[PDB]
Design a protein around this ligand. Structure first.
Ligand code: HEM
Ligand code: HEM
Ligand code: FES
Lengths: 105, 49, 75, 60, 378, 51
């Protein structure tokens, strides 16, 4: 709640800015490494998010190509960073582990 | 000959220090230098082999 | 596998492009060029440089200690 | 005794590719030797041009 | 329809370097694959011409080599392009393995392991290569190294004498190495084709580590020309060495004909092994050192199981970027050490860089990954 | 994260392949032994004492 939470939060906000994907207009979940669980979750995204996600990634690849970056104004502010993919991925993991528990019996 | 901390031998490859008896004292070498089979046939001659 | 036409699904994105025979190969080469490189350097010095100077210091010291260990004064 | 031979041989040693392999390797051991005996023994019998020469020239 | 697409031969070429979908993304660090290819044919091409003159017997070993540079027309550029090409080959090799680690390219299990096999192979190839001119360093570098296997319990002896063709680095030992150094680059090349076969299953990774299917471009004309330009640079580097500083990377000691009783004080392997040499002597044990030296390169195969981050590339991970360059710097220390005598400062600092190399890979990088995840709420 | 392979079924699976994995080691043992004419091991075998 107090100084303590803000400190961790500000340590997190610091790394975020240092990680620097926001400079390419990206979002945390856009940088997630695609594995089986991730592929399925990407698959389950509804039309809108999936479309936005592809354009974001395209904007970035395009930048990373000419090794430019976005104007400061358009970086993605921490806070404002939507974990759109998270709930889907969590459910995909939660599903797999169920098969995995079933496979032990 | 005559190199190393023991006034005997020093092998430069990985730092083997030997003494004047040919024994390993420092470095990675596992055993003492081999003593060949030999005998003295007189005061001036030595036959090794 | 591979092949264009079967990579992935994308919608609603337009891409405007221009013939190379219509544009210049080096637009503002130094004008925008140099600023960028400084920026990239700045972006990475704190992550790249520190280990290298750390080696450098250990290199020059280690060298001095070697040379100066092979002389003797009293004793 | 005859049908049951090939049979037992299949039963105890042939199904499981394990034993099937265990036997051929073990069977290769005994065979390699027994073949080299007979084979050399054959090479000798048709010859005798060297070796019994030894009994003569040395023995000291 | 189009011949390039359907002819049983061109299909290959076409799907390998013409129509192949490639990231719009890949940067200069991606040029090393083609440069490694160029280094390979170059070593094969000059290497061949060198074999049309070099003779493989101790009596003329050194002599033939000299014959090459003085009498054989242009045998000198050929000889030097060869020698320097070997170094260029190692520079690109190390750069290539560098790019892979930084960018997470190793997530391609098979492609990468074939690369480890490519590494040991080009390494084993070059160790034998340098024994050929039968110089002091050749014989001696050949002696130091071969013997290493003599630590393997119950069998090191028998084995070392077996690959020696005697009780020492003799005549048997030179012709042998010529033969293998001739056949290894052909096998390298076939194994490199399987490298590409497997790589082509996924396409290239890229600087962001994010999938690029959404923005793929044809290999020609983009990466044919970006590959052309970068080869010209490799020609610059290569030619700068042979035409200006031909011996810079070479020991002067190998210019003195071998002598089995001599034994130089100086005694080091070629520059491209110094880091591994350092790691080896930093251990006061016969078995230890060798085991550790092996573990030093075979650890490239442990890397994928040590991947811990939720992101593939290191581009967006600074704790890891720092650790990475520490790893580079620590190898540079290892190179430096291995080139120095086993005395004073050098011993203990050499033993520090060693533990570090292993701590950095086996523990520090994996941990930094877990922390960077934690910092992102992942 | 090898916990995925830890449970009753997996334990039954391991027991089922034990005789096979054992026999496959018997094959590799004799296999090396015979192929290198293992002086140490072979001396014990009756009839394979060619010395
Ligand atoms: C015989 C030397 C080698 C040759 C000729 C060779 C050839 C190539 C070529 C032509 C590429 C195309 C894309 C690129 O360069 O990025 C490539 C990529 C790759 N190589 Fe190698 N390689 C060699 C050694 C290695 C080594 C030593 C490793 C690592 C142990 C390695 C693992 C990889 C990986 C993982 C990629 C994928 C790169 C990416 O997409 O980011 N290869 N190689
Ligand atoms: C199959 C093609 C190759 C042939 C025919 C070949 C043949 C030769 C011959 C005859 C020599 C002794 C003459 C001399 O030293 O100038 C030599 C030296 C060498 N080549 Fe190769 N080799 C080939 C591929 C390679 C490869 C793949 C490498 C690894 C990059 C390599 C690196 C070396 C090295 C390190 C030496 C000894 C150093 C020196 O040049 O003095 N060559 N080679
Ligand atoms: S060979 Fe003598 S110390 Fe290594």
């Amino acid at each position: 709640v107090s100084a303590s939470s803000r400190w961790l939060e500000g340590i997190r906000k610091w790394y975020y800015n240092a990680a620097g994907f926001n400079k390419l207009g990206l979002m945390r979940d856009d940088t997630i490494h695609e594995n089986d669980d991730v592929k399925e979750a990407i698959r389950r995204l509804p039309e809108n998010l999936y479309d936005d996600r592809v354009f974001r990634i395209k904007r970035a690849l395009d930048l990373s190509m000419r090794q430019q970056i976005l104007p400061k104004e358009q970086w993605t502010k921490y806070e404002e960073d939507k974990s759109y993919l998270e709930p889907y991925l969590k459910e995909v993991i939660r599903e797999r582990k169920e098969r995995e528990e079933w496979a032990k019996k | 000959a005559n190199a190393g901390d023991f006034g005997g031998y020093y092998c430069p490859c990985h730092g083997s220090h030997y003494d004047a008896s040919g024994r390993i004292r420092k470095g990675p070498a596992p055993l003492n230098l081999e003593v060949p089979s030999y005998e003295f046939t007189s005061d001036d001659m030595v036959i090794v082999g | 596998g591979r092949q264009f036409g079967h990579l992935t699904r994308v919608r609603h994105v337009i891409t405007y492009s221009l013939s190379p025979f219509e544009q210049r190969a080096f637009p503002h080469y130094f004008s925008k060029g140099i600023p960028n490189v400084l920026r990239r350097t700045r972006a990475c010095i704190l992550r790249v440089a520190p280990p290298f100077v750390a080696f450098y210091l250990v290199y020059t010291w280690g060298t001095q200690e070697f040379e100066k260990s092979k002389r003797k004064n009293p004793a | 005794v005859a049908p049951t031979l090939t049979a037992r041989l299949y039963s105890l040693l042939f199904r499981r590719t394990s034993t099937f392999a265990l036997t051929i390797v073990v069977g290769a051991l005994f065979f390699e030797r027994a073949f080299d005996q007979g084979a050399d023994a054959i090479y000798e019998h048709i010859n005798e041009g060297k070796l019994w020469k030894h009994i003569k020239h040395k023995y000291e | 329809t189009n011949i390039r697409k359907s002819h049983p031969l061109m299909k290959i070429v076409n799907n390998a370097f013409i129509d192949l979908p490639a990231p719009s993304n890949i940067s200069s660090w991606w040029n090393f694959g083609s440069l490694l290819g160029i280094c390979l044919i170059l070593q094969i091409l000059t290497g061949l011409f060198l074999a049309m003159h070099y003779t493989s017997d101790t009596t003329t070993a050194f002599s033939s080599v000299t014959h090459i540079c003085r009498d054989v027309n242009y045998g000198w550029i050929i000889r030097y392009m060869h020698a320097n090409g070997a170094s260029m080959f190692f520079i690109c090799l190390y750069m290539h393995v560098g790019r892979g680690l930084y960018y997470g390219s190793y997530t391609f299990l098979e492609t990468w392991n074939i690369g480890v096999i490519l590494l040991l192979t080009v390494m084993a190839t070059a160790f034998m290569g340098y024994v050929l001119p039968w110089g002091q360093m050749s014989f001696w570098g050949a002696t130091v190294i071969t013997n290493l296997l003599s630590a393997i319990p119950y069998i090191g002896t028998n084995l070392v004498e077996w690959i020696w063709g005697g009780f020492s680095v003799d005549k048997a030992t030179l012709t042998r190495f010529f033969a293998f150094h001739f056949i290894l680059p052909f096998i390298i090349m076939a194994i490199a084709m399987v490298h590409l076969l497997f790589l082509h299953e996924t396409g290239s990774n890229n600087p962001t580590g994010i999938s690029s299917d959404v923005d793929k471009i044809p290999f020609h004309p983009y990466y044919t020309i970006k590959d052309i330009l970068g080869a010209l640079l490799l020609i610059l580097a290569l030619m700068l060495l042979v035409l200006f500083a031909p011996d810079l990377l070479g020991d002067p000691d190998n210019y003195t004909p071998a002598n089995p009783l001599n034994t130089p004080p100086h005694i080091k392997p070629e520059w491209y092994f110094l880091f591994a040499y350092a790691i080896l002597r930093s251990i006061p044990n016969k078995l230890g050192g060798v085991l550790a030296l092996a573990f030093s390169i075979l650890i490239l195969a442990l890397i994928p199981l040590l991947h811990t981050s939720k992101q593939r590339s290191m581009m967006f991970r600074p704790l890891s970027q720092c650790l990475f360059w520490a790893l580079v710097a620590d190898l540079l220390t290892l190179t430096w050490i291995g080139g120095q005598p086993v005395e004073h400062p050098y011993i203990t600092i050499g033993q520090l860089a060693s533990v570090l190399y292993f701590l950095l890979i086996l523990v520090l990088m994996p941990t930094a990954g877990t922390i960077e995840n934690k910092l992102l709420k992942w | 994260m090898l916990t995925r392979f830890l449970g009753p079924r997996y334990r039954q699976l391991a027991r089922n392949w034990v005789p096979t994995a054992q026999l496959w080691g018997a094959v590799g043992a004799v296999g090396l032994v015979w192929a290198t004419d293992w002086r140490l091991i072979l001396d014990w075998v009756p009839y394979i004492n060619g010395k």
